[PDB]
Amino acid sequence: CKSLISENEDTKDLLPSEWQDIIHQREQELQIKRDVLDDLYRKLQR
Amino acid sequence: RQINKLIDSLPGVDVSAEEQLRKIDMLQKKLVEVEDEKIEAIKKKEKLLRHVDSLIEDFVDGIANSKKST
Amino acid sequence: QSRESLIMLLEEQLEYKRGEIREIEQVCKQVHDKLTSIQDTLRTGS
């Protein structure tokens, strides 16, 4: 057990607000991308 | 026969030079209008060009301040 | 024949400038079409 824990870094990392922060950064970048794409769509149609 | 087929193929061989004079004059006229039209064409093309440049700059600023927002 | 030389030079520069002009609107129109296609592509990805 301890050996198997030892060789794998990923499991030991697996072995809580950071996920929420990543979700917030993803959604803010998504919404800013949507806003800039809307601006480009509005401007280019002329 | 090449002499005959070249002498009769001279535009203006059977056309009086004075209607060439009017056609040339109106050619320079319509030329004046065609470079005029090219002037408006190029100026509006440059107008849309720097509209595109302005939106490029705005989008680049948005990218920059978004990716440095975190 | 001087008038004929004037005529021939006339049509050669006239056709040259028409070719330049027509390639200008062709290239700007193809750029505009590419921009519209990109706008549609980014709108579909929204």
UniProtKB/Swiss-Prot annotation, chain A:
Location of motif Nuclear localization signal in this chain is 33-46
Please give the coiled-coil regions recorded for this protein.
Answer: none
Q: Answer whether the UniProt record assigns the keyword Lipoprotein to this protein.
A: no
Q: Which GO terms describe its cellular component?
A: core mediator complex; cytosol; mediator complex; nucleus
Instruction: Write out the GO MF terms.
Output: structural molecule activity; transcription coactivator activity
KW Transcription regulation (keyword) present:
yes
UniProt keyword list: Activator, Nucleus, Transcription, Transcription regulation
Compartments where found = Nucleus
Biological process terms from the Gene Ontology for this record are: negative regulation of transcription by RNA polymerase II; positive regulation of transcription by RNA polymerase II; positive regulation of transcription elongation by RNA polymerase II; positive regulation of transcription initiation by RNA polymerase II; RNA polymerase II preinitiation complex assembly
* Primary localization class, coarse: nucleus
Q: Which residues form the signal peptide?
A: none
The family line of this record is:
Belongs to the Mediator complex subunit 9 family.
Q: What does this protein do?
A: Component of the Mediator complex, a coactivator involved in the regulated transcription of nearly all RNA polymerase II-dependent genes. Mediator functions as a bridge to convey information from gene-specific regulatory proteins to the basal RNA polymerase II transcription machinery. The Mediator complex, having a compact conformation in its free form, is recruited to promoters by direct interactions with regulatory proteins and serves for the assembly of a functional preinitiation complex with RNA polymerase II and the general transcription factors.
> What's the further remark here?
Present with 1364 molecules/cell in log phase SD medium.
Protein name as it appears in the record: Mediator of RNA polymerase II transcription subunit 9
First and last residue shown, out of the full length, are 101 to 149 of 149
UniProtKB/Swiss-Prot annotation, chain B:
Annotated keywords: Activator, Coiled coil, Nucleus, Transcription, Transcription regulation
Q: Which domain of life does the protein's organism represent?
A: Eukaryota
Keyword tRNA processing found: no
Q: Looking at the keywords, is Transcription present?
A: yes
Q: Which GO terms describe its molecular function?
A: RNA polymerase II-specific DNA-binding transcription factor binding; transcription coactivator activity; transcription coregulator activity; transcription corepressor activity
Q: Name one GO biological process term.
A: positive regulation of transcription elongation by RNA polymerase II
**Location(s) in or outside the cell:** Nucleus
Name the principal localization, coarsely classed. nucleus
Example GO CC term: the record gives:
core mediator complex
Which residue spans adopt a coiled-coil conformation according to this UniProt entry?
15-55
Whom does it interact with, and what assembly results? Component of the Mediator complex, which is composed of at least 21 subunits that form three structurally distinct submodules. The Mediator head module contains MED6, MED8, MED11, SRB4/MED17, SRB5/MED18, ROX3/MED19, SRB2/MED20 and SRB6/MED22, the middle module contains MED1, MED4, NUT1/MED5, MED7, CSE2/MED9, NUT2/MED10, SRB7/MED21 and SOH1/MED31, and the tail module contains MED2, PGD1/MED3, RGR1/MED14, GAL11/MED15 and SIN4/MED16. The head and the middle modules interact directly with RNA polymerase II, whereas the elongated tail module interacts with gene-specific regulatory proteins.
What is the stated purpose of this protein?
Answer: Component of the Mediator complex, a coactivator involved in the regulated transcription of nearly all RNA polymerase II-dependent genes. Mediator functions as a bridge to convey information from gene-specific regulatory proteins to the basal RNA polymerase II transcription machinery. The Mediator complex, having a compact conformation in its free form, is recruited to promoters by direct interactions with regulatory proteins and serves for the assembly of a functional preinitiation complex with RNA polymerase II and the general transcription factors.
Q: Which family does it belong to?
A: Belongs to the Mediator complex subunit 21 family.
Any further remarks? Present with 1391 molecules/cell in log phase SD medium.
First and last residue shown, out of the full length, are 71 to 140 of 140
Swiss-Prot record, chain C:
Q: Which domain of life is it from?
A: Eukaryota
One molecular function GO term is: transcription coactivator activity
A Gene Ontology cellular-component term: mediator complex
Query: Nucleus among the record's keywords?
Result: yes
One GO biological process term is: positive regulation of transcription initiation by RNA polymerase II
Tell whether ATP-binding is among the UniProt keywords: no
- UniProt subcellular location: Nucleus
- Supply the alphabetized keyword list: Activator, Nucleus, Transcription, Transcription regulation
Q: What does this protein do?
A: Component of the Mediator complex, a coactivator involved in the regulated transcription of nearly all RNA polymerase II-dependent genes. Mediator functions as a bridge to convey information from gene-specific regulatory proteins to the basal RNA polymerase II transcription machinery. The Mediator complex, having a compact conformation in its free form, is recruited to promoters by direct interactions with regulatory proteins and serves for the assembly of a functional preinitiation complex with RNA polymerase II and the general transcription factors.
On assembly, the entry states: Component of the Mediator complex, which is composed of at least 21 subunits that form three structurally distinct submodules. The Mediator head module contains MED6, MED8, MED11, SRB4/MED17, SRB5/MED18, ROX3/MED19, SRB2/MED20 and SRB6/MED22, the middle module contains MED1, MED4, NUT1/MED5, MED7, CSE2/MED9, NUT2/MED10, SRB7/MED21 and SOH1/MED31, and the tail module contains MED2, PGD1/MED3, RGR1/MED14, GAL11/MED15 and SIN4/MED16. The head and the middle modules interact directly with RNA polymerase II, whereas the elongated tail module interacts with gene-specific regulatory proteins.
Give any extra note attached to this record: Present with 7598 molecules/cell in log phase SD medium.
Q: Which family does it belong to?
A: Belongs to the Mediator complex subunit 7 family.
Q: What is this protein called?
A: Mediator of RNA polymerase II transcription subunit 7
Please tell me where this chain falls within the complete protein, as first and last residue plus total length: 169 to 214 of 222
